[PDB]
Symmetry: C2
Subunit: 155 residues, 2 copies
Amino acid sequence: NMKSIEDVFIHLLSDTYSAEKQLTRGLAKLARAASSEKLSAAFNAHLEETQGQIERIDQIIEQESNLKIKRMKCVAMEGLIEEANEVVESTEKNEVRDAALIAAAQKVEHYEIASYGTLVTLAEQLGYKKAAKLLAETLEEEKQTDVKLTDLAVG
Amino acid sequence: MKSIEDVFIHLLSDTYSAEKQLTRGLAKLARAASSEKLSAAFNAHLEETQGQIERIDQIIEQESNLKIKRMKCVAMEGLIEEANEVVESTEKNEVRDAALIAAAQKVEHYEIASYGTLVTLAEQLGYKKAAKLLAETLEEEKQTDVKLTDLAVGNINMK
Ligand SMILES: [Zn+2]
Ligand SMILES: [Zn+2]
Ligand SMILES: [Zn+2]
Ligand SMILES: [Zn+2]
């Protein structure tokens, strides 16, 4: 029940927090499952980045102190990760799997690209200038990763 | 999925189903929006979505080995259902419009990713006309996302 812009921001930020926490487990499996070590290396590097982004949200919460992470499961992200795992189970460890796994991971990143774009806007509107900057850092990383995924997808 | 063509046809059927579901969802969301600008944005994008359905249909009529498998895109169904849940969790004001724009951007970015993959793959399989039509859709989805960011920023006019 969202009655303020602040309610919306905190709900979305908790949504994304859960998405990040889930991704820490999911990306490890996907790196394992990939045929190319290039794709496995990208999945691992982004696992380290995802831990960094979780820490950024923790920094936002610690600084604002009127903000409290709501414990909720991000259902969308859970679906997207599970769709990646279904790719791994429906394919041999060949170039076909790598194509479909890149595709699933880009769906993951673009979920995040949308989410962090909204979070930046809302934090700017509510006056959380520092939080907006941290969220913008995370946004840019997500966009960078999708771009690298698109490259591995063509290369 | 044993070949790249199979991945292509599976994703194309997924996107087709997604576009079909968006035809219903975008109209309901236009109904629910508080701002007349947001409702007009949703309706115009409904018209564009119908065009994108037509593009995939033309690709299908043109390739003739390609066959849409009747399936449900569960991801898109979840994203639509979350936009509808915003409507039921809010009054008809700028709070609803902020959260509804957010949900619509999540839908759009599912599609941006999907169509980016479909373009990449169609270029590999030799469906040049199809790759060009899919790239037209990709650019539309991207533009819709930018228009939503503008409306998100214009949603609040305090300072
Ligand atoms: Zn992330
Ligand atoms: Zn990410
Ligand atoms: Zn569309
Ligand atoms: Zn669209």
